Amino acid sequence: VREPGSQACLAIDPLVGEEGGAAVAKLEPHLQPRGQPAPQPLHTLVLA
Amino acid sequence: AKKEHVPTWLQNTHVYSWPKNKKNILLRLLREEEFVAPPRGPLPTLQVVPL
DSSP states (O other), rough: OOOOOOOOOOOOOOOGGGOOOOOOOOOOOOOSSSSSOOOOOOOOEEOO | OOGGSSSSGGSSOOOTTTTEEEHHHHHHTTOOEEEEEOOOOOOOEEEEOOO
């Protein structure tokens, strides 16, 4: 008989870098609000 | 008479017919225009109603 002492099997486990991983970022455009005095289209009429 | 009887150089002006246009002939002799154009007014004012 032989003993597995020296030849024992190996388990594996990755060295995950999640602890130092950057996050996913969401973008939102800062709308030029119409609540603030934004301009409007100058629909014109004629006084005949 | 007919249109063909007018000398060519005279076709460039008003051609009257007698007696059909005798009122127009009188107006022409009086040197008074037949239609009175109303006096030219001012340009209209523009009103802005934005949306």
